[PDB]
Symmetry: D2
Subunit: 152 residues, 4 copies
């Protein structure tokens, strides 16, 4: 079982059912855990970025998906949580690379910027693409951890 | 009264570091590029250069940062680990503008292997020229980002 | 008065009211003329590409906007009409360049690929950006006409 | 039984013409690149090279075409003026795949100034490897494109 926590802001609430489906489409082993808003009313993205990011950081779920207007705010807020590597992706290539290079554990998307079929492709690619495990990538990821440690 | 802009790259993006310096200058005479990336084409680790630029922004030695790498993903992750930094991975004009309007972003990240140089130019100029809205909800959300930082400090 | 004919396929019908608004947002002089489907039922994109493209080619309207799934089919079909220069755009830069370089008269977008706020930006930029009128661009546009003539 | 792929560029994209040849080869041993772009960096008009490649596709001398220029917009407009050509301006994996699945596209167009080289690589490989669906509605729509051509012939 590979659990995937999902969070959104208000505009992306309209596609939260989409996001749940797209996670399931990546494979039977992928289990969506919806942690976003329950209504379409205005919320603050950092509150939902934080909820999902903490779950990833505490090893409660393997992955996170954050969808908002542009995804920029989501990516900034999520990355403030130690242990999180949150990747704002806009296409298949970035989705794949975020995993291959960065062993990213959260994918961020913009509902106002990226069409839903490309969001679908991003989520499936993100979840299916394995980390390369190559020496230089492992070293660089360790250096990110070291930046975290220096500010804790 | 000019505005300083720190620039960092990884190894592949070093090939366009002169581009990045020019694009900052093209945003206006008030923008002063401060190049802090690799001086050669030798292999480097992006977090080292992300940290260098991010720390300069956080300490207020410069107003803005520009980070260019393969995808920009690693740069955005690493830079955001520094308290006070709001680093935005941008791929077009719209994201460049909205990073400023909504997030008051202080670092722009781009991917040299993903985004063509003329779009990188547009992103940098738009990022530097676009002011923060100052609207109530955006101020509140940015403060909530600061609160997340403090909880892990 | 600068008239702008609008056409869509079935999925993009959901945003046809958006497209009408975005044209108006470009300026008071821009007048949308909606020529797309009236319902959400399945249609064939070439039928609507052709309708809008013929209007542009016959100088009935100055510009066209075509929105579909990816915009690829729209761009291919519209360009089959002599006098049409249809540009599939995915961002501000392509929207602007299509006008500056190519004096494009139809903009094509994908509703499944490009978020609506970026579609808005594309349409406004397309309509507001003037053609450069530079020697080399005028020459290249004439060469496109010559390709048309050689197959007529 | 191999599949020929004609390649054309304008002047700026000439800098990556060797890239384009390699990327076609990377799609599989069955794909044979046929370079028909400029042999030098001298200034050229894109419609001349769009026409060259488009005519080769239309006459069935090759199966596919690849056109790379500044934005790719001019290439896509010019190539589509040739009867029998379905030229797709692509900016990512999704558009590359859907151009084949839905439109049975026979020419892929890219912008060197807009799209990074690794995404251009992905686009070319995806375009060549992805088969046409052959589904009833797509066949009908492609036939309607042919009908538009005939009405202006």
């Amino acid at each position: 079982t590979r659990r995937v926590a999902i969070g959104t802001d208000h505009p992306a609430f309209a596609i939260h059912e989409n996001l749940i489906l797209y996670v399931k489409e990546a494979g039977d082993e992928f289990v969506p855990v919806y942690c976003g808003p329950k209504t379409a009313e205005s919320v603050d993205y950092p509150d939902f970025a934080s909820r999902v990011a903490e779950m990833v950081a505490r090893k409660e779920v393997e992955f996170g998906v954050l969808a908002a207007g542009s995804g920029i705010g989501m990516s900034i807020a999520a990355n403030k949580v130690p242990g999180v590597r949150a990747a704002l992706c806009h296409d298949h290539y970035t989705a794949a690379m975020s995993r291959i290079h960065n062993d990213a554990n959260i994918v961020c998307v913009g509902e106002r910027t990226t069409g839903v079929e490309v969001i679908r492709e991003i989520i499936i690619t993100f979840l299916q693409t394995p980390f390369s495990g190559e020496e230089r990538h492992v070293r660089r990821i360790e250096k990110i951890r070291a930046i975290e440690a220096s500010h804790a």
